[PDB]
Ligand SMILES: O=c1ccn([C@@H]2O[C@H](COP(=O)(O)OP(=O)(O)OP(=O)(O)O)[C@@H](O)[C@H]2O)c(=O)[nH]1
């Protein structure tokens with residue numbers, strides 16, 4: 358359809374959500390963290406921080422950090438077995454404390470993943486993931502957040518994409534899903550950057566020693582042009598990814614303004630034979646460079662097949678206003 362039609366469907370689709378006690382979740386978690394270690398810091402990251410708002414159906418991401426991790430505000434995160442072991446170790450203590458203080462909660466220690474994480478589901482729609490000793494999630498969320506702060510309404514584009522990604526089965530949170538919400542944000546910002554709707558923010562300027570453990574709410578204003586900006590952005594975003602982004606040659610990257618190529622990163626078919634992560638093949642079909650992790654393709658799970666599904670969906674999204682006009 359047209360931007361306006363899409364815009365209105367989209368604003369229409371978000372009516373129920375435009376109407377948030379995370380400090381409380383934060384404090385409960387800090388209680389636990391405290392009981393495992395009173396000198397440990399708790400940082401929030403993920404969508405809550407990125408958007409400055411807490412969405413229904415979205416967990417809350419927390420990472421636990423030592424004073425020195427924070428002071429080393431711009432240090433990278435060790436990608437070693439020992440670093441992974443240190444994290445699993447502290448998270449197991451914390452998991453223990455969580456369970457002890459909240460017999461109601463399902464506290465799962467997840468090892469399937471690249472980053473040790475403790476997943477808590479209290480049942481009361483209460484959901485959070487806890488990781489440790491890593492600055493990269495707070496850092497890249499502070500980066501995404503700073504991008505959205507430049508153009509607060511672009512958050513609708515992001516949220517529209519996020520929700521859609523989960524409805525089409527593209528989001529890694531869904532079985533068969535290949536790109537995390539995080540990947541989708543990187544895509545959105547990258548897109549916003551290519552259209553000069555955002556000004557480039559060198560990732561190295563983000564300093565963890567300067568981010569808030571719990572950043573402030575960032576009011577989300579309804580798109581008050583009936584969604585025309587959004588509709589136009591969505592359509593443009595869909596078009597950009599089906600027709601301007603050259604997935605075979607380019608990398609969605611926020612590490613530099615402009616274009617990043619697969620060749621300069623050695624993210625080639627050749628590399629696929631070697632590149633492995635979490636004991637599996639990394640794919641370089643849909644390349645999304647993580648701004649802070651070395652050599653990490655956020656689209657590493659996008660297999661040739663999933664790449665085709667992404668194009669299908671991106672094409673479909675155009676004529677369904679991201680599955681809203683139905
Ligand atoms: O591959 C990843 C995935 C996630 N992350 C980090 O973990 C955070 C949470 O990762 P999510 O994919 O859960 O993103 P999100 O919070 O924005 O969205 P939803 O839960 O609502 O689906 C992201 O903001 C990012 O900082 C990574 O660093 N790398």
Ligand SMILES: [Mg+2]
Nearest residue numbers: 403404416418
């Ligand atoms: Mg999250």
